[PDB]
Design a protein around this ligand. Structure first.
Ligand SMILES: CCCCCCCC/C=C\CCCCCCCC(=O)O
Ligand SMILES: CCCCCCCC/C=C\CCCCCCCC(=O)O
Length: 127
């Protein structure tokens, strides 16, 4: 399907509770709470190059679909995980008890991460 492009967050639910349970330090939660971050994807085959920019904070991640790689979380911690291609438009992965589902529909990306009873929801559109 090719997911290349630049997108910006339009809306989100449960950012604070989810981020809290992730151990993201208070002040950052307060700061990123109101930042409409930009995400850039470069998709080439099973190679996904991902860059997330939140104001002055940037995180670079790169992984191969199906392969176990090391993902950098927003705290700085690094984890190992396999990102899978579920269906034709969904990228699914699991780490630290979190279940992550990214669904692509043209200009719209919908991301859903569930931790316990919390469901952090993000809706982005291509810019
Ligand atoms: C697509 C998977 C979901 C990615 C969620 C990313 C969430 C990032 C969380 C917030 C980071 C907080 C950074 C606060 C601002 C730091 C620098 C600044 O002030 O500009
Ligand atoms: C807890 C947040 C830590 C974020 C680390 C990155 C994890 C990303 C894992 C899944 C890859 C799916 C890529 C989807 C990009 C969506 C961009 C967006 O929603 O802004």
């Amino acid at each position: 399907m090719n997911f290349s492009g630049k997108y910006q967050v339009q809306s989100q639910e449960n950012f604070e509770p989810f981020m809290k349970a992730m151990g993201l330090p208070e002040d950052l939660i307060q700061k990123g709470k109101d930042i409409k971050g930009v995400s850039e994807i470069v998709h080439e085959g099973k190679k996904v190059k991902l860059t997330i920019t939140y104001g002055s904070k940037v995180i670079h991640n790169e992984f191969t679909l199906g392969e176990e790689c090391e993902l950098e979380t927003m705290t700085g911690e690094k984890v190992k995980a396999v990102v899978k291609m579920e269906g034709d438009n969904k990228m699914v992965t699991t780490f630290k008890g979190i279940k992550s589902v990214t669904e692509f529909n043209g200009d719209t990306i919908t991301n859903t991460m569930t931790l316990g009873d919390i469901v952090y929801k993000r809706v982005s559109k291509r810019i």
